[PDB]
Amino acid sequence: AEVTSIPTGCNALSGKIMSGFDANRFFTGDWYLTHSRDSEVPVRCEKYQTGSNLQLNFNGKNGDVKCSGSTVSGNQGFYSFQCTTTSGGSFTSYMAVVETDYANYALLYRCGLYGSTTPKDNFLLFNRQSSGEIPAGLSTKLNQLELTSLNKLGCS
Ligand SMILES: CCCCC/C=C\C\C=C/C=C/C=C/[C@@H](SC[C@H](N)C(=O)NCC(=O)O)[C@@H](O)CCCC(=O)O
């Protein structure tokens, strides 16, 4: 059966997502994951490569990861990505773009179960440049979401 809403425990962020999200402008080019609310060690620099039809590739923890996306019918703005890893792993992950200017930065929410019963989520800051940091345009939004000290990752 089709999965029609994000996992129980994931935040649908009703009322907190940008209006007029343009998938065509977001899912093009490269995005570097430069900061996140929660982070692991050692920090890394993941470059997310996008292609047509919600396909993406990134350099993950242990090998390249390839994902295929689709819209989540019950949750506006959300996507479900089915991913496979070069070590032979597979997982599902959910995301929504909270705010983006398409040409410089994007604040995303990500959530998934990953085989557990308790979801793991995060807020992610993507930048078009590996040297990208926290944009002035997100100041108020980050305050509203209580994201006052994003962790810098391994990009520079
Ligand atoms: C343009 C931006 C597009 C964003 C697309 C959104 C989602 C699909 C892409 C990546 C998903 C990664 C999920 C990783 C799982 S861990 C999932 C699994 N255990 C695994 O083997 N992961 C391999 C690996 O992470 O390298 C956890 O590390 C996540 C922890 C919390 C978080 O940061 O979301």
Q: Which domain holds residue 63?
A: 1-156
3-state secondary structure of 37: coil
In the chain, how many domains are there?
A: 1
Candidate from 40, 91, 127, 147 with most ligand 1 atoms within 8 A of CB, to mutate = 91
Cβ proximity of 91 and 112 under 8 Å: yes
Q: Measured in whole angstroms, how far is the alpha carbon of residue 145 from the centre of its chain?
A: 16
Q: How far is CA 48 from CA 55, 60, 115, in A?
A: 10, 9, 23
CB of 21 shorter than 6 A to ligand 1: no
Q: What is the 3-state secondary structure (H, E, C) of 106-127?
A: EEEEEEECCCCCCCEEEEEEEE
Q: Measured in whole angstroms, how far is the alpha carbon of residue 72 from the centre of its chain?
A: 15
Token readout for 69 is 């996306």
Cβ proximity of 81 and 94 under 8 Å: yes
Candidate from 83, 84, 126 with most ligand 1 atoms within 8 A of CB, to mutate = 83
Cβ proximity of 13 and 109 under 8 Å: yes
CB of 120 shorter than 6 A to ligand 1: yes
Which CATH number belongs to the domain containing residue 23 in this structure?
2.40.128.20
Cβ within 8 Å of residue 55, ≥6 positions away: 66, 67, 68, 69
Method by which the coordinates were obtained: X-ray
CA angle 74–78–84, rounded 5-degree value: 115
Q: How many CB atoms lie within 10 A of CB 147?
A: 18
Token readout for 113 is 């179960």
Q: Are strands 78-85 and 90-100 parallel, antiparallel or unpaired?
A: antiparallel
Q: Measured in whole angstroms, how far is the alpha carbon of residue 55 from the centre of its chain?
A: 14
9 sits in which H/E element: none
Instruction: Using the structure block, give the residue that is written with the tokens 């900061």.
Output: 35
